[PDB]
Amino acid sequence: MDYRTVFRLDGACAAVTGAGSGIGLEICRAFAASGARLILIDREAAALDRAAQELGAAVAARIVADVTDAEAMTAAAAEAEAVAPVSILVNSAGIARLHDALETDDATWRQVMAVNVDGMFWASRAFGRAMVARGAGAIVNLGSMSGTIVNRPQFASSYMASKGAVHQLTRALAAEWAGRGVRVNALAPGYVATEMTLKMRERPELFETWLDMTPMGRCGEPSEIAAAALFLASPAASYVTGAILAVDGGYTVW
Amino acid sequence: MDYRTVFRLDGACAAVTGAGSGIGLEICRAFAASGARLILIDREAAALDRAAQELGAAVAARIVADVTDAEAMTAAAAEAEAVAPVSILVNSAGIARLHDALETDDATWRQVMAVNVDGMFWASRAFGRAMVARGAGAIVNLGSMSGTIVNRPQFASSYMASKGAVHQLTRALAAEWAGRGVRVNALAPGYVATEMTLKMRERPELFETWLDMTPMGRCGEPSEIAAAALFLASPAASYVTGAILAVDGGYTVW
Amino acid sequence: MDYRTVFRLDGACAAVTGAGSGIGLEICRAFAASGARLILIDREAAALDRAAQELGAAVAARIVADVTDAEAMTAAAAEAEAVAPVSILVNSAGIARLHDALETDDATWRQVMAVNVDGMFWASRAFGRAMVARGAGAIVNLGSMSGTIVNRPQFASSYMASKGAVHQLTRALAAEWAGRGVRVNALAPGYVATEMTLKMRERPELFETWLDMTPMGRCGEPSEIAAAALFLASPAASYVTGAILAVDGGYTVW
Amino acid sequence: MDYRTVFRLDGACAAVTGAGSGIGLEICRAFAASGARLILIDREAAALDRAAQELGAAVAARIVADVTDAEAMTAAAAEAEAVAPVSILVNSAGIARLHDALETDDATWRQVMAVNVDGMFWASRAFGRAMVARGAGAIVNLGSMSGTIVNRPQFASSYMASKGAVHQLTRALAAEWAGRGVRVNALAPGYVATEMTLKMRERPELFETWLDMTPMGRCGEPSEIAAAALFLASPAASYVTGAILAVDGGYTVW
Ligand SMILES: NC(=O)c1ccc[n+]([C@@H]2O[C@H](COP(=O)([O-])OP(=O)(O)OC[C@H]3O[C@@H](n4cnc5c(N)ncnc54)[C@H](O)[C@@H]3O)[C@@H](O)[C@H]2O)c1
Ligand SMILES: NC(=O)c1ccc[n+]([C@@H]2O[C@H](COP(=O)([O-])OP(=O)(O)OC[C@H]3O[C@@H](n4cnc5c(N)ncnc54)[C@H](O)[C@@H]3O)[C@@H](O)[C@H]2O)c1
Ligand SMILES: NC(=O)c1ccc[n+]([C@@H]2O[C@H](COP(=O)([O-])OP(=O)(O)OC[C@H]3O[C@@H](n4cnc5c(N)ncnc54)[C@H](O)[C@@H]3O)[C@@H](O)[C@H]2O)c1
Ligand SMILES: NC(=O)c1ccc[n+]([C@@H]2O[C@H](COP(=O)([O-])OP(=O)(O)OC[C@H]3O[C@@H](n4cnc5c(N)ncnc54)[C@H](O)[C@@H]3O)[C@@H](O)[C@H]2O)c1
Ligand SMILES: [Mg+2]
Ligand SMILES: [Mg+2]
């Protein structure tokens, strides 16, 4: 094996949903440093305009699209594939909403499940079709430790349910496409210091518990999550499929 | 503890969704034999009437309702509570649809998720409200080995994803309601001989593999799932919450 | 199915290691109340003096033996079989030792693995032989949440390693004996109030953290564990083999 | 982050047990290519001859030792520390023996556990001591899919139990040493083409099942396991501790 290039993505084109912020943006930085071209996908146009400057020439296309709109995902894949064959997909678009179960508005349950699960399936179906047609591809889904355990003390049962579905969706597609050369894996991060968690990290009644139940005693930085996505997306992970990789500072060990 | 009676349900009233058929109907038989009175809930009115007739005096109410209708679930729990305090809920209503991921109509993905996950949350919120107000209750969710592994050879990614979300919804409500006396657990059955599976069991190209992949070499009967549901719904399981109990003939061992 | 007898053990003889204290003793009480006669196995004679005096006529034999002595297990099964066919085995003999990993003496590691893993294999091979020949049997092993997660704040790496081995021992024998009618399952309890934990529960610096990290906010009672073992040993669990059943007040859900 | 260098091991010294063959030897190749110096540890002096002549100046020391000999592992860590600080430990020494449970002699069970579990503890205690003192290190343990599921059709209950202990030993040391900067993770490979499996791969009555039950339809190459071990040993895995990373071609997805 050539280990000095096994983690690189030279020649590849990767689509990333949720590319305008947070983990998804950091994954774009990791993938551009590793030689990939990028299809940036996000619902928020101004975030894509910022990303595309921090990324420059690695950027092959910039597609404003809602992952919950199935037809917009199938259009996004066809737009991307006219630019370059897309061999990597990262599903990072996702949302998290706090709600107590007995006081849950129906729309909040529905929205969290639509972005985190349904939109991951529309994007994986859209982009996975040409990968299956080529007989090669790699998908990396953003699961969570919340697909394995339940967070404390805050409540958000739609988020835990949505991430249990992401982990099984990952595994389902891994099994169905394994014979067709497309690997599908998920990260299960612990708390990460981004745009999704900053409001809760400013309430000591949550944050002190979150650190106390992490053996490493800190949140992860986005780059620690992006380095693991780069491993799963690269040829170094060529025998890894259907895996749920904990990247959580030990949270799920206790 | 009086082991003589710890598995009984005398004086309890249990609500069962999916009570008209299959596992749900057999759990109603088991619960009535254990002393419970019953709230039967099912979308199919003839199957409900036929269950209500068979169960006789054990039936406290018969409610024709769709679990995907959150308003209908809230109304069903108000109707039930007017008859008797409901201290057990079994969410057995569920559907399975075969589909190849790249040939998936959108409506199939959506409706499997609506029944299997959203309906379970609507019903659990609706009936759990009075359990939490009373400081006591037990919920048994029908998960599946498909929430832990992926079936073979047939494809149904929406079913796998739905059952991952069932297992984590179970756990999320177990965590949220632990301190107010409501236990929430899931069964994860292997193949069971019900109407859900009958067409597929009639296809040797499926069924031979099913039996070859089960260490016990046979498909479970509904009574073998209902006995495990009775365990989890009874006081014998008073320290069991958030558990996913495999009842699969060993399928998930291999 | 007759649900009113499906959890009973009438006519059975159950061998229970660790019968002199704690969970094993309470399992003896539960199985006697369920119609079984008992083979009490413990290396503490004085504890078998007390347990036999309480259990009275349910006792078919009392055997002072060390489960780490393979030859004494093979002889114990032959001594039991001479009195009655043993159709249930409960492996509850076990020890826990607190130790810093880097300063562990070789003897502590070896002691804990010998009792908790090797002894469970020697007893299972010894008692399982005649079960396999009869085509019928049930074995219940005492795993732990410590086979799934790692306890805090106290360290006991040999205990965690031994309970990971218990869980996979259980599943290995469930797979190998499934076609010959012997089911093998494990309980994975959370903290239980027995002599194994009494002086640890008297150290606030441990006990406060144990309760804080259990969603139900209390230790389990030995009867709560014994009811779950009675489920697994009974015909109600006829479709359950290779399962690891958490009985932990929700500890592994967080 | 500089993703260009985050997978490198420049300046590091890694000790590898089982370096003489298979996965351990391929990990030494991958580690040498990534800038590390190596401490080769194996019981086989003729295998060490071959490995050392290939790896050349990458070798800081070669030590003929049995990992089951606790004193030899303590002496190896001292010998290695006198050459360079050891900041990475790979526990790859391991054995597999086929045995039916009821025909198992006691010495087979003991020695599989002694190499696979006890020797991993002795080696991690010995080498881990200097890492914890420095407040930095990474350990990668060779677990297996056999710590999660049970192989078929061949029986080897001691191997399954040993690998369950490996996964929980990994997690216990990750929790105990997380505050001291030492990460501890395990790989859980599917079948890999090495000398451990050569005889079984040459038996169609095993091998056809192994391929049939792997979604990828092939065994893994040692390099595919070494690249994963390099990920976990490197700073790219800086937020990964106590993880069990499946590298199994999808085996554990079904
Ligand atoms: N931050 C964490 O602690 C953490 C922990 C574990 C898992 N995760 C998961 O990682 C993923 C990314 O999290 P993040 O912290 O980067 O979040 P973020 O809020 O910083 O970024 C999410 C991005 O997704 C986009 N997005 C949201 N909904 C969309 C939609 N319907 N269509 C298209 N784009 C959409 C947003 O515009 C945004 O740019 C999510 O799935 C999240 O659940 C985050
Ligand atoms: N049969 C199996 O092999 C198996 C295995 C594992 C898990 N399960 C799960 O167990 C549960 C019961 O399965 P089963 O085999 O008894 O199925 P079944 O088809 O025999 O019974 C399902 C019942 O649910 C009712 N139902 C369906 N959708 C509904 C809705 N929207 N609102 C109200 N009622 C509705 C149906 O009318 C029917 O009476 C399901 O969640 C299923 O996924 C079944
Ligand atoms: N108490 C708990 O919190 C807890 C939690 C989870 C799992 N467990 C497990 O449950 C099992 C029973 O625990 P417990 O709380 O009843 O412990 P206990 O200490 O109260 O009882 C253990 C019994 O096993 C006997 N025993 C110990 N080593 C033996 C050997 N070598 N040979 C024969 N007999 C031996 C002891 O003499 C004693 O009577 C153990 O495997 C333990 O690890 C306990
Ligand atoms: N090959 C596979 O399919 C596979 C699959 C999953 C996990 N594993 C695990 O990966 C590890 C390496 O396996 P492999 O395929 O490279 O095996 P291998 O047999 O090719 O190499 C094992 C090496 O360990 C050495 N060794 C054995 N016992 C020892 C002892 N007591 N002290 C010192 N050295 C000793 C051997 O001499 C040999 O050089 C083992 O833990 C194995 O269980 C292997
Ligand atoms: Mg936990
Ligand atoms: Mg499997």
Closest to A200 measured CA to CA, from A155, A138, A145, A143: A155
**C203 alpha carbon – ligand 5 mean position (Å):** 22
- Which chain D residues are Cβ-neighbours of B149 within 8 angstroms? 252-254
Torsion angles phi and psi, residue D64, rounded to 5: -85, 110
The protein residue with its alpha carbon nearest to ligand 3, atom 25, reads C18
> How far D91 CA sits from the closest chain B CA (Å)?
25
| Contact between chains at C161 and D146 (C-beta distance less than 8 A) | no
Q: Which of residues 113-152 of C touch A (CB under 8 A)?
A: 149-152
Q: Going by CA atoms, what residue is nearest to atom 35 of ligand 3?
A: C93
- Record the tokens describing residue A106, joined without a space: 């129906």
Residues B220 and D173: their CA atoms lie apart, in Å, by 40
Please report, as a single letter, which amino acid is at residue D232. L
Residues C124, C141: Cα–Cα separation, whole Å: 9
User: Which partners does chain B have (≥3 C-beta pairs < 8 Å)?
Assistant: A, C, D
Q: Judge residue B112's burial from the number of C-beta atoms within 10 Å of its C-beta, 0-12 exposed, 13-18 middle, 19 or more buried.
A: buried
Q: Helix A119-134 and helix A157-177: axis angle, to 10°?
A: 10
Identify from C4, C27, C253, C254 which residue to disrupt to test chain B contact, counting B C-beta atoms within 10 A and taking the largest count.
C253
How many CB atoms within 10 Å of residue C72?
A: 20
Alpha carbon distance C122, C133 (integer Å): 17
Dihedral, A160, A165, A170, A174 alpha carbons, nearest 10: 150
Query: Does residue D171 contact residue D242 with C-beta atoms inside 8 Å?
Result: yes
- Work out the minimum CA distance from C175 to partner chain B, whole angstroms: 6
Residues ≥6 apart with Cβ < 8 Å to C160: C146, C147, C150, C151, D168, D169, D171, D172
User: What is the D36 CA–ligand 5 centroid distance (Å)?
Assistant: 35
Q: Identify the burial level of C198 via C-beta atoms within 10 angstroms of its C-beta, where 0-12 means exposed, 13-18 middle and 19 or more buried.
A: exposed
Of ligand 4's listed atoms, the one at least distance from the Cα of D91 is 41
The verdict on whether omega for the bond into residue B153 sits within 30 degrees of 0, i.e. cis, is yes
Who contacts C137 (Cβ-Cβ below 8 Å, separation ≥6)? C86, C87, C88, C89, C127, C128, C131, C177, C181, C182, C183
Alpha carbons C253 and C248: distance in angstroms, whole number: 9
Using CB atoms, pick whichever of A152, A213, A254 lies closest to residue C150.
A254
Partner A contacted by D173 (CB < 8 A): no
Q: Give SS3 for A39.
A: strand
Residue type, D103: E
Asked if B228 is an interface residue toward chain C (Cβ–Cβ < 8 A), one would say yes
Provide the CA D137 distance to its chain's centre, in angstroms. Answer: 16
How far, CA to CA in Å, does C54 sit from each of A14, B229, C26, C39, C48? 70, 33, 11, 14, 10
Q: CA B127, CA B81: separation in Å to the nearest integer?
A: 9
Method: X-ray
Distance C105 CA to ligand 3 centre (A): 21
Give A149's contacts in chain B (Cβ within 8 Å).
Answer: 171
Are A27 and A91 in contact by the 8 Å Cβ rule? The answer is no
Closest to A113 in 3D by CA, of B117, C72, B241: B117
- Among protein residues, the one with the nearest Cα to ligand 2's atom 41 is B94
The residue whose two tokens read 């959580």 is A248
Give me the residue label for tokens 């958000």.
Answer: A156
Query: Chain C interface, mutation test: which of D157, D158, D180, D252, most C Cβ atoms within 10 Å?
Result: D157
Instruction: Give the separation between CA B96 and CA D149, rounded to whole angstroms.
Output: 26
Read out DSSP for D171-198? HHHHHHHGGGTEEEEEEEE--B-SGGGH
Asked if residues D118 and C114 have their Cβ atoms less than 8 Å apart, the reply is: no
Cβ of C129 and D102 within 8 Å?
yes
For residue C27, the surrounding DSSP H or E stretch is helix C22-33
AA letter at B152: R
- Tokens 């983690």 — which residue? A7
Tracing tokens 């109304």 back to the chain, one arrives at: B75
* D212 CA to centre of ligand 6 in angstroms: 12
Longest dimension (CA), chain A: 55
**Contact predicate B172/A157, CB 8 Å:** yes
> Do residues A253 and A50 touch, judged by C-beta distance below 8 A?
no
* Residue among C163, C172, C242 minimizing CB distance to D168: C163
Q: Are D33 and A6 in contact (CB under 8 A)?
A: no
Contact call for residues B168 and A150 (beta carbons, < 8 A): yes
User: Which has the closest alpha carbon to B213: D149, A24, D205, D164?
Assistant: D149
* CA atoms of B71 and C238, how far apart (whole Å): 39
Enumerate the β-bridge partners of residue A88.
A14, A138
Judged by CB atoms closer than 8 Å, whether chains meet at B161 and A176 is answered as no
* DSSP-derived 3-state class of residue B1: coil
Nearest atom in ligand 4 to the alpha carbon of residue D159 is 43
Portion 234-253 of A in contact with D at CB < 8 A? 235-250, 252-253
**Angle at A209 (CA atoms; ends A203, A215), nearest 5 degrees:** 135
In chain A the domains, ranked by start, together with CATH numbers, are: 1-254 (3.40.50.720)
Nearest CA to C128 out of C176, C61, C162 is that of: C176
Could you identify the atom of ligand 1 that is nearest to the CA of residue A143? 7
Whole-angstrom Cα distance, residue B213 to residue A161?
Answer: 28
SS3 state at C92: coil
Mutational pocket test of ligand 2: of B90, B195, B196, the residue with most ligand atoms within 8 Å of the beta carbon: B196
Nearest in space to D87 (alpha carbons), one of D44, D23, D35: D35
- Residues C166, C147 contacting (CB under 8 angstroms): yes
- Quick check: D135 and D180 in contact, CB under 8 A? yes
Helix-helix angle B119-134:A157-177, to 10 degrees: 150
A166 vs D232: CA distance, rounded Å: 24
User: Nearest Cα to B188, choosing from B172, B170, B203, B176?
Assistant: B170
Retrieve residue D137's tokens. 């290190």
Q: For a ligand 1 pocket test, name from A196, A197, A201, A225 the mutation site with the most ligand atoms within 8 angstroms of its C-beta.
A: A196
Whether omega before B189 lies within 30 degrees of 0, making that bond cis, reads no
Q: In this complex, which of C101, C102, C164 lies closest to D164 when CB atoms are compared?
A: C164
CB atoms within 10 A of CB A198: 10
Beta carbons of C239 and B248 less than 8 Å apart: yes
Instruction: Please give the Cα distance from B253 to C185 (Å, whole number).
Output: 11
- Most distant CA pair in chain C: distance in Å? 56
Tell me how far apart the alpha carbons of residues D242 and D172 are, in angstroms, rounded to a whole number: 8
User: Apex CA A229: angle with CA A110 and CA A240, to 5°?
Assistant: 100
